């Protein structure tokens, strides 16, 4: 009876262990320490730039973990492939983001690292920077195209992990992105973020003054938004958690009005199934049927006529 976002755990740090072929190990230790001169010397000496440990970390991965900007530049300069993945499927960009190494993030991004790459647990750089509350990396990633909506295979998002981890600022930046002002649940409805919705809703159990039925200025609920954008999943969740199916906004507008006006067929279906009133009327006499007609959404009309 729990909603629980998965946590990116990072790479190991065996190279930090003081010793108390072996050329390779020593080379990786030099990378971990950020000793450019030593690393360059080994490379000149012929050691392979792609040398990695049992977990698949090369020197680029180690320099990035540790914020060694200069060294990251040198390795990149020498042909280190920006997006080599470790065995967990992490790129240097994942690692730097989890670790909050902002200058390193910049350097990798400018080198064309894939800003939306997913690890084999489905995590993105943004998910990592978000999980760990690395604000500046978050902002930087957003400003550079990173997509908040790229999700673990179970729909886990940066917003969801920021929420679970209690990170107010992260949550703010994530909610406030690409808008130039709705409540969070509403925004989660827009985005169709069931997990984040679930998280937000975890403390009202039992209709009117429930959080699931809070309104915006114009009296819309998360359910109205869901209906507007045609987000069936998040709508289903809200309705399961007690959203009033026939809740009227300004002008007696119901979620069914909204979905009918936007020709959102499956929303209409869902709302009907949950008992939404087929014939409710706006302050000016419109029915869901009329709203759809005035909008050429025939798909709906048909469906809507059948029911009657």
Numbering used by the authors: 1113 to 1132, 2029 to 2188, 2192 to 2217, 2221 to 2322
From the article:
Ankyrins are a family of scaffold proteins which play essential roles in connecting numerous ion channels, cell adhesion molecules, and receptors to the spectrin-based cytoskeleton beneath membranes and thereby provide mechanical support for plasma membranes and control the activities of excitable tissues including neurons and muscles. There are three members in the human ankyrin family: ankyrin-R/B/G (AnkR/B/G) encoded by ANK1/2/3, respectively. The wide-ranging physiological functions of ankyrins are the result of ankyrin's remarkable capacity for binding to and anchoring numerous membrane targets, via their N-terminal 24 ANK repeats, to specific membrane micro-domains in coordination with spectrin-based cytoskeletal structures. The 24 ANK repeats of ankyrins form a superhelical solenoid with an extremely conserved elongated inner groove, which contains multiple quasi-independent target binding sites.
Surprisingly, we found that the C-terminal part of the ABD (ABD-C, the 27-residue motif identified previously for ANK repeats binding) binds to ANK repeats with an affinity ∼15-fold weaker than the entire ABD, indicating that the ABD-C is not sufficient for binding to ANK repeats. We further showed that the ABD-C fragment binds to repeats 1–6 (R1–6) of ANK repeats, as ABD-C binds to R1–6 and the entire 24 ANK repeats with essentially the same affinities. Based on the structure of the ANK repeats/AS complex, we predicted that the Nav1.2_ABD-C may also bind to site 1 of AnkG_repeats with a pattern similar to the AS peptide. In particular, the hydrophobic residues of Nav1.2_ABD-C and AS occupy very similar positions on the hydrophobic groove formed by residues from ANK repeats R4 and R5, and subtle conformational differences in the finger loops of R4 and R5 can accommodate amino acid sequence differences between the two targets. Unique to Nav1.2, the binding of ABD-C extends all the way to R1 via charge–charge and hydrogen-bond interactions. In contrast to the common expectation of directly interacting with positively charged residue(s), Glu1112 of Nav1.2 is buried deeply in the groove and forms hydrogen bonds with the sidechains of Thr94 and Asn98 in the R2 and R3 finger loop.
